[PDB]
Write a protein of this length. Sequence first.
Lengths: 435, 435
Amino acid sequence: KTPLAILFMAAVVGTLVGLAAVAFDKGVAWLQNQRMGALVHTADNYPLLLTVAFLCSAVLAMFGYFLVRKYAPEAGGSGIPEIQGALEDQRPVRWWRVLPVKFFGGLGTLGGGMVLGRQGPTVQIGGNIGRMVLDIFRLKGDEARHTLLATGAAAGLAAAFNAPLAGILFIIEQMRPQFRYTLISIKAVFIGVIMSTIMYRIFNHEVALIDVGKLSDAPLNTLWLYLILGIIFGIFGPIFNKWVLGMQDLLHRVHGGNITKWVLMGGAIGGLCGLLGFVAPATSGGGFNLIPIATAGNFSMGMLVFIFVARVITTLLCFSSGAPGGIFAPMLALGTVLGTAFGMVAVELFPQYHLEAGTFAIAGMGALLAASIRAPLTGIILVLEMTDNYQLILPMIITGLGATLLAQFTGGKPLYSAILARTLAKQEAEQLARS
Amino acid sequence: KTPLAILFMAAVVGTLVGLAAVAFDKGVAWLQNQRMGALVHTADNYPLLLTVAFLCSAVLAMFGYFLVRKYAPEAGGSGIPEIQGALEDQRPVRWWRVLPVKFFGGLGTLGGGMVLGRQGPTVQIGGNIGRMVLDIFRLKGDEARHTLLATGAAAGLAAAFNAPLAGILFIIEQMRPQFRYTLISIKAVFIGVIMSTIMYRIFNHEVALIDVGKLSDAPLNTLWLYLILGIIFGIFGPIFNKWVLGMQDLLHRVHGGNITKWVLMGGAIGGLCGLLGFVAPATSGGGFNLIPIATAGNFSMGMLVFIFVARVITTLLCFSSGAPGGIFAPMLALGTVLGTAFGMVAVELFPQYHLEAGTFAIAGMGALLAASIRAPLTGIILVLEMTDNYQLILPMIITGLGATLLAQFTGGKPLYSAILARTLAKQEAEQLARS
Ligand SMILES: [Cl-]
Ligand SMILES: [Cl-]
Ligand SMILES: [Cl-]
Ligand SMILES: [Cl-]
Ligand SMILES: [Cl-]
Ligand SMILES: [Cl-]
């Protein structure tokens, strides 16, 4: 009866999520190209070019910050904490607000060149799309409601980075405590992921989404260095997480919850990233365009330290303000830069081992996700499906374990669970409306 | 306190399992080469060559069947149903019997050229190794006992086919209902898999374990054919499973549980496979040497039908008798042959689509595991780590879903769960010893 209705709806959800993820992607790419086109007007007067670049990114940012604070407060930030909450029945899915705001707000913020990524946006959009078709078709039952939320979210992740294996792992690993695993619920996840992936492939050439060439394999006597890399990320992960929650509390003292001040602060952050797009490209943007540049070895050791410091600052400023945008693609840039640096050192320390810094760059992306988000297998596979370097499978599991151990040992928690816990706590507290 | 003891013991288990898996592998390869060497004596008198080939495989088979029926009845068959049972507290782990019998019995049966594979042997050996070091070190606690069983089993699977990603998926997907997922229990699985994989790599060149070259990718307008392939395997999977349980009941009427008759029947089965090694190579052996031959397109359509029929017969005869040996590698051969046949038809039916039979061969391996064993993600990844054809990720998820749907719809169950259910049922029944 209703089990076959669920499996057919999953296919509908997967197709619609897929087209939304491609629209979001193509929309953000067009806006960035439109900005570079409107600045050809001031081709050889650099002062005025930087000034209108600033105001152009400030307006789009202010547009996004406005939509979130006015129509959908829960569309601020990543999206994953909110979906995670909804899979527990702890949070609503207001798709009539979150789909228009997250889409058109995320176009303004990522489109302006802010230090934000697509994962959280499209995963939340996918989940709301999943709830939308449930509410449109009037499917009744607690299983259907929960199941289509899950297939919508997985489909969002798979369509965003062309990563179907990762979209399934996002539900069976990262959302293990929330997800009610049944025979029908897991087939629906597969169907939604299959359909959303086909929609990506119709519009994009199937390739390495992060073209980093084909690196060398990792020899046996080399493998221990990936455990040391993992340990380093293990201690750094929980510190970074303390900084993104701290920076939410600190940036709140600026505006005090007031819409006008909040939007103006977003315009400054948005404007600044739009400026830094031009004067120092590697310090700004989501992170994708600089990962292959860094992994190839084009930066000096001193330059990698500068990008790392600058990026941690612009990453925290963008994400913690509560702009609609994810921290996934920023974190990949941070792990690439720190991993390449680690790689450079090891190359000079051990001339015997026949090493290459780029293998440690790719391990670094997996390591930072493992240490902060604490869903290792999902991050490791995500990075492999985007780089297509499947011979680094063992190195990355070793780095992921390193990161996972020391992150638990040094008192870290999963970033997304921590943010949801603060949202739930703050909501309980504001039942002082109840005296 | 005890959490750090568990993570250090996992490393010990992973190393020991790794060396046992390599020893088993190298032992089985040496015996097969020793048999081909002792038959050079009768190089140009073919009648006597086949006769001693028969008696040579019959003795080794009789040796294996003897060890199982005399010292460790639960070492007969795969191993996975028994481990699965132990993870539920429903079955004992008699490592003082199962390690010597499974190892030296599995050397005689797989070494004689019987239609049996290494997965079940090494997974059960790994689990017993995990319980052995728990009992040696006298670790107390229900968590430790359960956890090291799990890391031992995963490590066995990862070391047997050089498949670390698959060894983790074997516990988080295939053993989901049994496995008590905690922060410490999952890190221990990782550690055991890391260490066992290193032990494989020390003794074997890291390559494609099934060298099948680099096939073409799957174009978009082609993807629907993999769903039809999946559907076909979906209906065939539960039928095959009915035949392996049926063939256990039928082959039991031969000996009636009597040790003498049982061993003699094993010698006939063992002898026959040793003969068929020489007169018709593709009808016998575990399956690994004929998968690349079939995938390359060297067999005519008529020959693929003959191998399929012959193999289903020799696969059921070998496995269902209760010889120590797995059905995993046999099933891969069956899915390769049926998939190549399907591939050939589609190539001629659609000259427009620019297809290759070999893509459907690899999809077929995933499809038969999905339809019988019913752990799709684990099988699909296993096949990718052995063939190294990571561009067929989406085709295989589509075939796995096809297979998983129709196998549930047509009333199939997971092979391993079905065998364990019959073992538990038969044990309850023989408490008629209680009047
Ligand atoms: Cl957030
Ligand atoms: Cl993101
Ligand atoms: Cl995110
Ligand atoms: Cl069995
Ligand atoms: Cl096997
Ligand atoms: Cl098996």
